[PDB]
Design a protein around this ligand. Structure first.
Ligand SMILES: Nc1ncnc2c1ncn2[C@@H]1O[C@H](COP(=O)(O)OP(=O)(O)O)[C@@H](O)[C@H]1O
Ligand SMILES: Nc1ncnc2c1ncn2[C@@H]1O[C@H](COP(=O)(O)OP(=O)(O)O)[C@@H](O)[C@H]1O
Ligand SMILES: Nc1ncnc2c1ncn2[C@@H]1O[C@H](COP(=O)(O)OP(=O)(O)O)[C@@H](O)[C@H]1O
Lengths: 51, 234, 435, 436, 445
């Protein structure tokens, strides 16, 4: 299966090891993936069913 | 006391520990992708392979399909019972002609006879000591055993030891496989080594492979002493 | 953008259908009779009937001998072989000089081979080999962006496929006529089996799996000689590091030449090949030793020898290798009997001015008429080449002062800055310690 | 990089010229020779335009008068990424290569091809590696987490990068650059963690960088000759590269330039002491200078009406007139006392020598009396005598002691003429004994 | 074909009668009656074969026909008799001595003749099958060979099986097997299996399936020079040394052993000796060492008949500081018989020009032929012999098929001989580079 960024739907290059969400590049990582509240990750990964 | 290692390898910045050979040369010859793609490797827009066939196969003068008279002439000259041997001689490199040389039989009705020097050589293969031909043909080993050369020490060591210069091409795996095949050719590296004995016993008895189907091994020349086999001195 | 180096304004001999030259045509100014001789030699060469015909064109220096040879090469075309050569090149340290002369002779006889190219490339979807320890055949299915196509293949090709480490999902390159196997890499569809992988991922080929292409192969006789005369042996297709032993050139025996001639003769009459003889051009032929001049005699009488063009700019000069043989143009009287001598007259003022204007045109420089007359008087006073080589410093010194056009003062500045041979000799004679 | 102690022309950093190609009195370590510097600047703009080729320039003058200094200034002001080959006249008399073949190699070494290509690279900071193996090692799985100063990631690796990571062993705390296409692992070093030393990379992990490549004609000629590999570029056994391979290279560079995948940069070939060449070399040179792929040749000589080698007659500058017709000649001149004083001051500041002013005037006087090079050579010896008596400034008697100790040319000729009975003459006659 | 119109291609042998009396114009040779008679005597000397070690000289002025006589005796020599034509400058090598170069030139032109009987089984293999015994020491093979007319079954031994896994055939490859010697080859693949494998690969070739009778008897004759035997028996694989020339100074004991076995084969009766002719054109640039080696190498029983040609007058010999007749020292000239050519007259020049233009397929007029005959009377013959070829091209430049006098006059004004070039150089000597490197380049003083 093809891998994609969970935020924008772009092509996913990296997966953050703390919370296991794929992202595209630096800005989406820094302003989305790092400072997000807990409980958002489980509804982000519910879309592809990875929880 | 060792030669200086002019190389860069994986060093540790300190149920088993695996060590892999990773010695490389510090000098790197950086080459672009365009030259290697457009002049070495064939593609649709160049004619490397077509010219190679047209120069090596079609217009080869030892082709039996076109120069059968020349093949018969050279077969009468050499007395070799295969007409395709000249094609196989002319189209493989030198060391490939070296390491699988087989002492095949040649017919008597030919012109390549036994040279008197070659007959003098061939007499003294399995001849033992105190024979007149063997003693006249074994001067150098007599000088080896009389001058006590097998227990002599080593006085000279090289100062720098370096690997061959690594060529790098960024963005291509074919160059990496080709370079790994050229540096670590398994046929030549098996010719420059030997098979372990338990491995041989697994070849012959436990797997049924006969002895004459083995890859050729043990072509490395022996050093003069046990001391001369290495550059590291204790 | 574009480069010029004392040439490339020469496009041809500038002749009409009757073989008469115009005054200024093809980049040539003046020099009628030598151009007629060159056109007749071009027609004789295009007749494709003769072996060993020789031509020597002689004259003073800076007269256009090399320009005439290049005009011959341009009028003949790029299909016919043309081998430029300096006479000093025949002195090699690896083989004898007569050997190198024979290779430069046989470099001027070309061939035209009609060949085809068929190529299979694309996605590997099936690798199923079958036996009857020894495989019988392998069936490989190839896939591209315009459809799939399965093939049957022989185990000899399967050995190269195994050598190339080809598995399911790779993009390969199969040339059916030669048997070449090339691995490009893994597909873009298999890029997500791992996050980090050591393989390179390429997209699918956008064309069809099977492509056909007609090609024309040109080889000379010297390539066929050197292909059968390798002393070490044959080489593989991919050789990035050379053999451990150095192969040097060896003298090639006449027997191999006889067999190569037999093979080419057996291939010509079937219509496969087309024989094209060409030109061996030797410049500065006075530099040759007498033994090369004697072997030139025997080499010119061969049945496959090309048309040889020589040039010289000497007078009553002793040929090298001798002490008291005064001969015209540095050619001995034995070889000069078999030659045909074309003279080359020098130029006057107006043709030198026309040449200066023509070369200023091709270098995209704009000169006034007053500077043009000064450059013409400079060329007649000093040398034609000295007026030739001051054009680009004049352009630089005009461009320095934000000008696109040459004035007289830039020519005077370049006159003061750069010297010719005679002013340098005058400074050399009136000097104290080694200029 | 580019280690160098102190060279003879190390004080020259380029041609001192303004934007209107005019020479300054003193700029970039060069004084004097205004018209020669202007002509070399014209040559520099001629090369930098690059629209013409195959033009030969002869530089002639008296010895020890700014010739090799001019060539070093041209080479320094050319900068990098332009091929510059500096050969001597005696480098072509080889025993394994012929003279014309060596000239062809030196001609093709000065034309470069500019190639631009891109290669995506991964470079970051290794935090933690996990390795799981079986008993036989048939199946291996691994996790690699890696980072920059900006981002964080974890990577699932196949077995081949596992093998290529246990080869050239990567530990935690390491800075590694990873190539995805060829699988090359390079250890840049360890990062800043006290718990060599380099910094953690910033920006994106998967960087796509372009590089500008330069390759000479001679490199492609060696590679496309299938008889020897690229080791002949270093070992030097190219061994008489044929002509059809050169024809293929010459056609394919034009085929590359018309498709726009490459550009050709021209360079300068410098043949220093060109008067030591043979006549057969010059004869090759007149026809080699009219090629499309020929550089601009700079030649230097100092002989005057000398015998050309390989002949029996005499020619101006040691070169026959057919070669001199194809050349434009720059002429240098001798130096005044003020220019010699300026050169000596520049060489004093270069070698970190402190002088007294009267010692500088003495050096100027003995420089305009004997030679420039003798005065430029005594200035290093006098500093050592100054440090032998433990003082920094070089005074007049410090230079005088070096003048007494170390000899010049004409004085030595005078004592040779005075005491020739104790030396070996041309006839091999000497006297050794002091008595009778 | 691969032979263009050479300088002397019209010469097909020597135009002699039965009683060695030369015809005036026959077999492409015009005139030179005593020279052609002497060359016929030398031809009968070679065809006799019982005289060895004789050296002749063809000495004459340039453009007279010495190498024309050599080409004639080469063509009238016939086939299977060795004829080595070298120049005088070919023996100055860098990896071979001049002595060994003359040795190889001496032994390249003496050959032995070998006759043998060949029986060939050439066809397409239908099916192979191998029988293996329980002990495995003996093997049996069923061979199903075929041609387009008849097919049969042959029994095989273990040795052909071992040699048949090598260069393995795949039931449809064309092979040929000898019965008397066991010669094994693979000619290639039949055209019936051409559309089979869809990519034939690197090491195959497509040949036609043979027709006719499968079992063929054919006697072929091989002529082998001695130098071939010395270069084969000097190494392990000497045929690469045959075709690459890197023999590298073969020793002398191999030569005397080959001479002894050649004498043994002659007395036993397997082979017969075929002597040949050695032609050395322009022998006058040989060193005195080469001359001494020649006059000693002419006294051996296995030595050919040497033909030398020269055109120098009384000139110096290279390596010394004195002059000699014909450029050769008198010790060599003592062991020789000299053939002297004579210069031509009007009618022989006209006949040679007519024969050359007929050979070159050039159609002329009578007036143009007379003008070119006068030109070859004043100038040399070869100037007219090239002028006919240039004037022919000028003739089809005018859309005319015949050669007129105007084309000859145009070619004469366009193209110069030696004398006009010497005159025009000596008139304008300031514009040419002299022996001291002085030339007035500029046109204005
Ligand atoms: N008839 C002509 N028309 C135009 N240019 C000419 C003519 N003759 C000579 N030239 C130029 O003059 C130069 C003479 O150089 P070259 O021919 O090399 O000298 P040489 O004839 O001594 O070999 C050439 O570069 C050529 O461009
Ligand atoms: N214009 C200059 N500026 C600085 N140094 C110079 C100048 N001209 C000459 N020199 C010095 O003179 C010395 C001789 O110069 P060089 O050109 O190498 O010798 P030659 O003139 O014999 O070729 C050099 O060491 C250089 O430092
Ligand atoms: N007797 C002859 N019959 C026919 N052609 C001749 C005769 N003699 C000479 N020729 C022709 O004259 C041409 C030049 O003579 P050549 O044989 O080269 O003289 P030489 O042997 O002295 O060099 C040759 O091409 C040859 O064909």
């Amino acid at each position: 299966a093809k891998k994609y960024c969970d935020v924008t739907g772009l092509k996913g290059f990296y997966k953050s090891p703390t919370n296991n969400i794929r992202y595209h590049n630096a800005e989406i990582y820094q302003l989305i993936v790092k400072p997000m509240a807990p409980g958002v990750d489980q509804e982000y990964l519910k879309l592809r069913g990875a929880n | 006391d060792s030669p200086f290692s002019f190389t860069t390898f994986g060093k540790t910045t300190s149920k088993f520990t695996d060590l892999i050979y990773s010695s490389r040369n510090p000098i790197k010859y950086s080459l672009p992708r365009l030259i290697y793609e457009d002049l070495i490797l064939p593609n649709y827009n160049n004619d490397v392979d077509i010219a190679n066939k047209l120069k090596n196969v079609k217009f080869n003068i030892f082709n039996p399909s076109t120069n059968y008279e020349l093949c018969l002439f050279l077969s009468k000259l050499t007395g070799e019972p295969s007409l395709n041997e000249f094609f196989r001689v002319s189209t493989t490199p030198l060391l490939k002609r070296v390491i699988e040389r087989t002492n095949g039989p040649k017919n008597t009705d030919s012109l390549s006879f036994k040279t008197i020097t070659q007959e003098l050589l061939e007499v003294t293969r399995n001849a033992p000591s105190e024979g007149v031909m063997a003693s006249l043909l074994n001067v150098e080993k007599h000088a080896y055993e009389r001058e006590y050369l097998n227990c002599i020490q080593r006085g000279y060591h090289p100062n720098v030891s370096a690997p061959p210069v690594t060529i790098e091409v960024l963005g291509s795996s074919h160059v990496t496989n080709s370079i790994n095949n050229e540096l670590f050719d398994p046929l030549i590296s098996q010719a420059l080594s030997d098979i372990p004995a338990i491995t041989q016993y697994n070849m012959h008895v436990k797997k049924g492979i006969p002895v004459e189907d083995f890859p050729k091994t043990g072509l490395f020349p022996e050093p003069l002493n046990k001391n001369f086999s290495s550059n590291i001195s204790m | 953008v574009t480069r010029t180096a004392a040439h490339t304004h020469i496009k041809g001999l500038g002749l009409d259908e009757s073989g008469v030259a115009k005054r200024v045509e093809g980049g040539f100014v003046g020099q009628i009779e030598a151009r007629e001789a060159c056109g007749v030699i071009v027609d004789l060469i295009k007749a494709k009937k003769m072996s060993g015909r020789a031509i020597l064109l002689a004259g003073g220096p800076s007269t256009g001998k090399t320009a005439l040879a290049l005009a011959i090469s341009q009028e003949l075309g790029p299909k016919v072989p043309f081998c430029p050569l300096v006479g000093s090149e025949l002195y090699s340290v690896e083989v004898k000089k007569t050997e190198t002369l024979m290779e430069n002779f046989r470099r001027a006889i070309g061939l035209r081979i009609k060949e085809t190219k068929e190529v299979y490339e694309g996605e590997v979807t099936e690798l199923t080999p079958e036996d009857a320890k020894t495989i019988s055949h392998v069936i490989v299915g190839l896939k591209s962006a315009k459809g799939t196509k399965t093939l049957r293949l022989d185990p000899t090709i399967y050995e190269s496929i195994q050598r190339e480490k080809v598995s399911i999902g790779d993009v390969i390159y199969i040339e059916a006529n030669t048997g070449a196997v090339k691995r490009v890499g893994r597909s873009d569809a298999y890029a997500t089996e791992f996050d980090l992988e050591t393989e390179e991922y390429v997209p699918l080929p956008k064309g069809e799996v099977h492509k056909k292409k007609e090609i024309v192969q040109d080889v000379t006789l010297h390539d066929l000689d050197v292909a059968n005369a390798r002393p070490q042996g044959g080489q593989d297709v991919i050789s990035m590091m050379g053999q451990l032993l150095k192969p040097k050139k060896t003298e090639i025996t006449e027997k191999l030449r006889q067999e190569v001639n037999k093979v080419v003769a057996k291939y010509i009459d079937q219509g496969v090949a087309e024989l094209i003889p060409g030109v061996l051009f030797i410049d500065e032929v006075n530099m040759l030793d007498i033994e090369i001049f004697t072997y030139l005699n025997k080499a010119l009488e061969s049945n496959i020898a090309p048309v040889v063009v020589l040039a010289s700019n000497r007078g009553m000069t002793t040929v090298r290798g001798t002490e008291d043989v005064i001969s015209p143009h540095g050619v001995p009287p034995d070889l000069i009997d078999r030659l045909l001598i074309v003279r080359t007259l020098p130029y006057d003022k107006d043709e030198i001015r026309t040449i200066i204007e023509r070369r200023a045109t091709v270098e995209r420089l704009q000169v006034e008429s007053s500077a043009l007359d000064l450059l013409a008087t400079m060329g007649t006073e000093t040398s034609l080449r000295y007026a030739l080589q001051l054009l680009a410093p004049c352009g630089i010194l005009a461009q320095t002062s934000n000008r696109k056009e040459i004035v007289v003062n830039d020519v005077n500045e370049a006159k003061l800055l750069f010297l010719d041979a005679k002013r340098s000799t005058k400074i050399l004679e009136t000097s104290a310690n080694y200029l | 990089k580019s280690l160098s102690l102190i060279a003879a022309h190390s004080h020259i950093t380029g041609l001192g010229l303004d934007e209107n190609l005019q020479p300054r009195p003193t700029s970039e370590g060069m004084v004097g020779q205004l018209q020669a510097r202007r002509a070399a600047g014209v040559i520099l703009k001629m090369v930098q335009n690059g629209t013409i080729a195959g033009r030969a320039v002869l530089v002639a003058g008296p010895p020890s008068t700014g010739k090799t200094a001019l060539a070093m200034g041209v080479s320094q002001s050319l900068g990098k990424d332009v091929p510059f080959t500096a050969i001597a006249g005696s480098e072509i008399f080889s025993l394994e290569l012929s003279k014309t073949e060596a000239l062809t190699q030196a001609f093709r070494k000065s034309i470069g091809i500019k190639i631009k290509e891109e290669t995506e690279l991964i470079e970051g900071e290794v935090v933690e590696i996990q390795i799981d193996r079986s008993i036989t090692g048939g199946h291996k799985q691994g996790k690699l987490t890696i980072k920059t100063t900006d981002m964080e990631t974890i990577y699932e690796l196949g077995n081949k990068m596992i093998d290529g990571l246990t080869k050239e062993k990567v530990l935690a705390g390491d800075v590694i650059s990873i190539d995805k296409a060829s699988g090359k692992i390079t250890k840049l070093g360890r990062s800043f963690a006290r718990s060599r030393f380099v910094q953690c990379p910033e920006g994106e992990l998967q960087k796509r960088k372009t590089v500008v490549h330069t390759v000479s004609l001679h490199e492609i000629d060696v590679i496309n000759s299938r008889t020897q590999g690229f080791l002949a570029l270093f070992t030097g056994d190219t061994g008489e590269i044929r002509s059809e391979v050169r024809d293929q290279i010459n056609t394919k560079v034009a085929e590359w330039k018309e498709e726009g995948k490459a550009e050709i940069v021209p360079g300068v070939l410098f043949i220093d002491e060109v008067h030591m060449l043979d006549i057969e070399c010059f004869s090759f040179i007149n026809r080699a200078l009219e090629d499309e792929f020929a550089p601009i040749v700079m030649m230097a000589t100092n002989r005057g009406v000398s015998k050309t080698r390989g002949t029996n007659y005499k020619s101006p500058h040691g070169l026959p007139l057919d070669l001199l017709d194809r050349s434009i000649i720059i002429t240098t001149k001798s130096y005044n006392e003020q220019e010699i004083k300026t050169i000596l001051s520049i060489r004093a500041q270069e070698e970190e020598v402190e002088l007294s002013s009267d010692a500088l005037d003495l050096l100027t006087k003995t420089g305009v009396e004997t030679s420039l090079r003798y005065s430029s050579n005594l200035i290093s010896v006098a500093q050592q005598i100054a440090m032998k008596r433990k003082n920094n400034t070089v005074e007049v008697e410090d230079v005088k002691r070096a003048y007494l100790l170390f000899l010049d040319s004409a004085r030595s000729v005078k004592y040779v003429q005075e005491n020739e009975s104790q030396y070996i003459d041309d006839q091999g006659n000497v006297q050794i004994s002091i008595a009778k």
